[PDB]
């Protein structure tokens, strides 16, 4: 039971770090999604081809923004899955401690 306690502390620290990362990434994703909502640029509403602009450069900006969004969501899913798995294992460890007790 004593050994499990140290593992419990390590799991708690990992969970705290994961929660901090989740909050940070949630804020980042929220702001990025809001920026996309602002800069939709839908074609069917005649929002394309702004006059007298570097179309290639603006397209590159949009593509980079979309790629960053995809990477951010992928990382968020990865970290959330890892945190959920650790929490499930941590809860099981507590259940195992109950059996020992």
């Amino acid at each position: 039971l004593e050994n499990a306690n140290r593992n419990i502390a390590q799991l708690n620290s990992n969970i705290q770090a994961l929660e901090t990362q989740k909050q940070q990434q949630a804020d980042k994703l929220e702001r990025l999604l809001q920026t996309y909502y602002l800069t939709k640029r839908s074609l069917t509403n005649g929002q394309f081809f702004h006059r007298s602009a570097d179309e290639d450069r603006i397209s590159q900006y949009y593509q980079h923004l979309a790629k960053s969004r995809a990477q951010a969501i992928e990382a968020l899913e990865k970290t959330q899955t890892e945190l959920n798995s650790n929490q499930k294992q941590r809860q099981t460890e507590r259940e195992q401690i109950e059996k020992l007790l």
């Binding site: 996309y36 909502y37 074609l43 069917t44 006059r51 949009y62 593509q63 969501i73």
Partner: protein, 304 residues
């Protein structure tokens, strides 16, 4: 002396006419392919015209101006600001989009269902749309500056309002479509008649023998009518298939183009109504051409 039922003779004639196409493979196949292509091209032109018309109608909005409030702004504050803006003169109308309505609009797009669910509480800024009373660009700029300085907003977005250019492009496309469609319809109508004339000339001996016997004119005429109808039906079906195979490629190309920007677009294909009208037009054209050509060439054949 028993006679077959009225429908039975017509069905037998139709089956015989369909079977007749196998007599001469090369000519029939080539004419059918040309008919299919000439009926497919106007379909694609009309499809492009309809897409352009739909886009132009969508762009018909009178340069509506969008206003974004701060995400943390209280709901009663937003309501008060909307009421004040409505009270203010030079504003035709005010439309308020709630944060969750905007969230639904954003979720309509692909790839956003997962992120919204993953986020604990998605919070889009309250987007408000104000339609200027005067369409003048100077007035639009002045109103945008005033709204930005109103001290209750975070950003302001304005539209392009390029109605004239799209109207001119639509007019040009309409003229081109009408001209090319007329040319193709005339070409396909005339091509059928020539093949029917050649077929009639091919079996001169049989027609002479039948007219020498007391055969009626309608009996001689029916097989050519049904051959023309089969030509029309097969051509129209092939044209519809080609139109589908072309619209898939065009949709792919337009999606690739719009992918350069983060937004996406899809083409509106021809509806279920259009296909039926296309088949009807093909059948009507084929039957009329076959009837006129065959009858005119048949009047000039004597039994002896």
């Amino acid at each position: 002396a028993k006679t077959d039922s009225f429908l039975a003779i017509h069905f037998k004639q139709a089956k015989a006419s369909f079977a007749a196409l196998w007599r001469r493979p090369l000519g029939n196949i080539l004419t059918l392919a040309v008919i299919s292509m000439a009926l497919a091209l106007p379909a694609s032109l009309y499809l492009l015209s309809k897409n352009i018309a739909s886009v132009a109608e969508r762009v018909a909005e009178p340069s509506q101006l969008s206003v974004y409030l701060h995400i943390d702004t209280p709901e009663p504050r937003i309501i008060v600001l909307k009421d004040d803006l409505e009270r203010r003169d030079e504003i035709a109308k005010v439309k308020y989009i709630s944060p969750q309505q905007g969230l639904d609009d954003l979720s309509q797009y692909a790839g956003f269902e997962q992120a919204i669910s993953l986020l604990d509480n998605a919070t889009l800024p309250a987007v408000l749309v104000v339609t200027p009373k005067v369409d003048s660009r100077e007035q639009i700029q002045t109103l945008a500056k005033a709204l930005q300085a109103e001290e209750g907003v975070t950003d302001v977005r304005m539209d392009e309002d390029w109605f004239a250019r799209l109207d001119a492009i639509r007019h040009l496309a309409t003229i081109v479509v009408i001209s090319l469609s007329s040319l193709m319809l005339m070409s396909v109508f005339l091509i059928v008649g020539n093949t029917l004339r050649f077929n009639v000339q091919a079996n001169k001996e049989e027609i002479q023998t039948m007219k020498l016997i007391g055969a009626t004119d309608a009996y001689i005429l029916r097989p050519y009518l049904y051959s023309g109808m089969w030509f029309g039906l097969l051509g129209a079906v092939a044209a519809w298939l080609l139109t589908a195979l072309m619209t898939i490629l065009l949709n792919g190309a337009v999606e690739a183009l719009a992918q350069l920007y983060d937004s996406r677009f899809r083409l509106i294909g021809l509806g279920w109504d259009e296909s039926l009208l296309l088949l009807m037009l093909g059948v009507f054209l084929g039957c009329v051409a076959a009837k006129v050509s065959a009858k005119r060439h048949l009047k000039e054949i004597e039994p002896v």
